[PDB]
């Protein structure tokens, strides 16, 4: 079962999403059912390390240009049933010709800020709906490449703390 891999991405997307609500002080457990830490694991904690991995890199993106991570509902029409139009579009020009772990991490954070934006306008129906879209995107679209690249596990190794670290060390500047 290859599609099963989603099991890790599902919580990935649900976890990351919640991580975003935290910044805005949003009860992520009032939309889906984010019980708590520890979500299945028959080997060790792959998905766990995978989640954090995306969190780190995702921080690098937001820190780079939070501008893009601003009010998105004010620009386009975000409503239950129309949100699909946007996603399909954004996702199109986003992963048109190229994916890589890079676009992946940014993709997770993408829906993150977009979620808090919707819920803020009394529109949570798009929240969960988006979370599933982000995950299924892999099982449906971002799949053959995920494995070919070396499986979600490979991602962890490539963009692991070691990766995001170097970049932050040679980009953040610090001074």
């Amino acid at each position: 079962m290859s599609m099963a891999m989603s099991q890790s991405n599902r919580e990935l997307v649900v976890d990351f999403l919640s991580y975003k609500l935290s910044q805005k002080g949003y009860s992520w457990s009032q939309f889906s059912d984010v019980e708590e830490n520890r979500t299945e694991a028959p080997e060790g904690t792959e998905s766990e390390a995978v989640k954090q991995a995306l969190r780190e890199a995702g921080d690098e993106f937001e820190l780079r240009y939070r501008r893009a991570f601003s009010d998105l509902t004010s620009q386009l029409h975000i409503t239950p049933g129309t949100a699909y139009q946007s996603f399909e579009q954004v996702v199109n020009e986003l992963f048109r010709d190229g994916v890589n772990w890079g676009r992946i991490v940014a993709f997770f954070s993408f829906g993150g800020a977009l979620c808090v934006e919707s819920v803020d306008k009394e529109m949570q129906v798009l929240v969960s709906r988006i979370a599933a879209w982000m995950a299924t995107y892999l099982n449906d679209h971002l799949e053959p490449w995920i494995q070919e690249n070396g499986g979600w596990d490979t991602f962890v190794e490539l963009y692991g703390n070691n990766a995001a670290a170097e970049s932050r060390k040679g980009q953040e500047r610090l001074e």
Partner: peptide, 25 residues
């Protein structure tokens, strides 16, 4: 009409290209 999504993704794409460079290879 949809100004964001379309452009929204485009802008995000650029940052992506730069987002990665050392990790890969």
């Amino acid at each position: 009409n949809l100004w964001a999504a379309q452009r929204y993704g485009r802008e995000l794409r650029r940052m992506s290209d730069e987002f990665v460079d050392s990790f890969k290879k």
